[PDB]
Design an enzyme around this catalytic site. Sequence first.
Site, PDB file in Angstrom:
ATOM      1  N   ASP A   1       1.240   3.068  -1.408  1.00 18.57           N
ATOM      2  CA  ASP A   1       0.110   2.255  -1.891  1.00 18.57           C
ATOM      3  C   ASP A   1      -0.828   3.189  -2.665  1.00 18.57           C
ATOM      4  O   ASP A   1      -0.334   3.921  -3.534  1.00 18.57           O
ATOM      5  CB  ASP A   1      -0.493   1.509  -0.679  1.00 18.57           C
ATOM      6  CG  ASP A   1      -1.564   0.481  -1.061  1.00 18.57           C
ATOM      7  OD1 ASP A   1      -2.755   0.819  -1.192  1.00 18.57           O
ATOM      8  OD2 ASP A   1      -1.252  -0.719  -1.208  1.00 18.57           O
ATOM      9  N   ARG A   2      -2.155   3.192  -2.411  1.00 20.15           N
ATOM     10  CA  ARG A   2      -3.053   4.067  -3.186  1.00 20.15           C
ATOM     11  C   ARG A   2      -2.582   5.507  -3.176  1.00 20.15           C
ATOM     12  O   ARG A   2      -2.735   6.222  -4.167  1.00 20.15           O
ATOM     13  CB  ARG A   2      -4.489   4.051  -2.642  1.00 20.15           C
ATOM     14  CG  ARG A   2      -5.117   2.647  -2.435  1.00 20.15           C
ATOM     15  CD  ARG A   2      -4.812   1.643  -3.574  1.00 20.15           C
ATOM     16  NE  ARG A   2      -5.667   1.887  -4.733  1.00 20.15           N
ATOM     17  CZ  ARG A   2      -5.674   1.133  -5.826  1.00 20.15           C
ATOM     18  NH1 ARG A   2      -4.795   0.148  -5.977  1.00 20.15           N
ATOM     19  NH2 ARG A   2      -6.541   1.389  -6.799  1.00 20.15           N
TER      20      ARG A   2
ATOM     21  N   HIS B   1      -6.494  -9.199  -5.240  1.00 20.81           N
ATOM     22  CA  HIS B   1      -7.491  -8.257  -4.743  1.00 20.81           C
ATOM     23  C   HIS B   1      -7.755  -7.129  -5.721  1.00 20.81           C
ATOM     24  O   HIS B   1      -8.830  -6.512  -5.653  1.00 20.81           O
ATOM     25  CB  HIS B   1      -7.097  -7.706  -3.358  1.00 20.81           C
ATOM     26  CG  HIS B   1      -5.851  -6.876  -3.351  1.00 20.81           C
ATOM     27  ND1 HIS B   1      -4.600  -7.404  -3.576  1.00 20.81           N
ATOM     28  CD2 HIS B   1      -5.672  -5.553  -3.128  1.00 20.81           C
ATOM     29  CE1 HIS B   1      -3.703  -6.433  -3.513  1.00 20.81           C
ATOM     30  NE2 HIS B   1      -4.325  -5.302  -3.235  1.00 20.81           N
TER      31      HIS B   1
ATOM     32  N   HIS C   1       5.238  -4.830   2.550  1.00 20.82           N
ATOM     33  CA  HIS C   1       4.617  -3.682   1.885  1.00 20.82           C
ATOM     34  C   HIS C   1       4.648  -2.408   2.731  1.00 20.82           C
ATOM     35  O   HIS C   1       4.757  -1.304   2.184  1.00 20.82           O
ATOM     36  CB  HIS C   1       3.176  -4.062   1.566  1.00 20.82           C
ATOM     37  CG  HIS C   1       2.387  -3.031   0.818  1.00 20.82           C
ATOM     38  ND1 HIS C   1       2.788  -2.513  -0.396  1.00 20.82           N
ATOM     39  CD2 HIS C   1       1.165  -2.499   1.073  1.00 20.82           C
ATOM     40  CE1 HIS C   1       1.853  -1.697  -0.853  1.00 20.82           C
ATOM     41  NE2 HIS C   1       0.861  -1.669   0.020  1.00 20.82           N
TER      42      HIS C   1
HETATM   43 CL    CL Z   1      -1.658  -0.224  -4.459  1.00 23.17          CL
END
Ligand code: CL
EC number: 3.8.1.3
Lengths: 297, 297
Positions: free
Chosen positions: A107-108, A152, A277
């Site tokens: 993810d990030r 989001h 995810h």
């Molecule tokens: Cl992300």
Amino acid sequence: LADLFPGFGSEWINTSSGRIFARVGGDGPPLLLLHGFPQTHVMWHRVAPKLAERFKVIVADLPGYGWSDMPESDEQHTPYTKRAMAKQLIEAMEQLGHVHFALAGHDRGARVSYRLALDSPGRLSKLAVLDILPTYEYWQRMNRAYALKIYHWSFLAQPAPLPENLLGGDPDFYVKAKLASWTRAGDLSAFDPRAVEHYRIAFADPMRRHVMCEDFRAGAYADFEHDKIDVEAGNKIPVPMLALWGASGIAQSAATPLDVWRKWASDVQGAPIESGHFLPEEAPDQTAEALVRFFSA
Amino acid sequence: DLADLFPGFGSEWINTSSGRIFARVGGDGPPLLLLHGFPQTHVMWHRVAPKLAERFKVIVADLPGYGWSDMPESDEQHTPYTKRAMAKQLIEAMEQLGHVHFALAGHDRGARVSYRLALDSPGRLSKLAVLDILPTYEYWQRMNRAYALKIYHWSFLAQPAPLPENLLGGDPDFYVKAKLASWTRAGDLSAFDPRAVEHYRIAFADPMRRHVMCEDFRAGAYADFEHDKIDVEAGNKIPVPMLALWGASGIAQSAATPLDVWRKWASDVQGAPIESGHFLPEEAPDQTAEALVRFFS
Ligand SMILES: [Cl-]
Ligand SMILES: [Cl-]
């Protein structure tokens, strides 16, 4: 809060941008693991023990997340851009004596990781990115279906304090609904409840929530622009690369992820995993196996 | 104590098969229906309705589920808050007053009711004005990164319940005030009469009213888009004489104008920009009223 990394030590690593908290375990070649949103380093707790049988594993909180310090942001969201986060984590690894290391992000943290590979390829032996496409590719794909599916990105990127003020009324509900909504089954059953409590406690701090919004603001603006420069110049990551994604995750929405990553990297392999995810929690044995084999080869 | 902002106007509750419509009714002459949008009520017309009531019988109605109109029970397809259904309900309300052929001006969501009314039942309309909108189909076709960021609330408020409802309950006053201020030219609340702002705030304070608004945007993302797509694919154009007004600092600047867009949707349309943000009747009441009086007379 529970200790989810039995026998791992801890480090609070100074950098010019603030301290990075990490759990540290194992022995062997150095491997940095980077979480994303809305999680902390503890999302690696089900794969880190197995990785530590073969590597020196550094499980870090991103700049401004978990127990890392929170630099004051600015009008360009600079400290929470992936370029700046990558620079800060490079400094942190140098404090441990690691100037060339293996890296896996989710993810990030996977965005930090591929930006690190674009800016400073010499820092990395190998790179794995989990359930992401590049930020440029998400935005280029933007249309009605994507805007509705992955809202989001644009919501959390709205100018402050609008998302901060909305998130403040009932933060527990938002973070638990996000964790559940992105899993294969749509509930919290994939997560150790002790790990959920780590995520909930971090999300309950308004300063931590502001950092998350700055991260998504960077993702809408400077991160996108950094990516746009590379794709329009035809720059590809030369570091050997693994792309792992969930068959029910964010990255696969309407794109074949390996084909996307081959446009961004000249030596990439990849596979889906049956998972939403949160690959390292929903599918820990397969994720750990995929990572151990990739980084060992 | 909400302020009476319509001197010389009555107050009417009009029965329909889907619930009551509230309206302020003033003037004499040919009938003109005025329809507000989000996040407002009928009172947004208070600076232009008197000038129109010099020449027309002016009916200033709260949209189905908005303001003081009743809230029909929704369903899984958001049917009562689709613009097709709202238009049917307002056609029924006008029949109760004996108006089967009338002039119509709408703003924001009310302008979407209005052009859908003209596509479905053109015989009901002598003339049609829409204020600072394009068709819903066109806005979704335009939904790239830039539009996802500016028009984020189309995707945020369309998320499945209870996500936006839960977020909106924490501080509704802040959200409604931001959604008023952000698209004015000034970027603050100074264009609005404070008594009108209190009407908007009181409506938005009610969880049931906010839920209706979210249903409106859910319809806007799904059924309303599909209804518009059928007309586009059929080459259907509005035959009703039409005026398209827009804010110079409202709809984003493109090499094509909003009049260019509406000419693909309507065979007899004129248009002009107004020096205004999104909220034409409150930011630029003299210019808006002058243009509407000239058009409808
Ligand atoms: Cl992300
Ligand atoms: Cl992605």
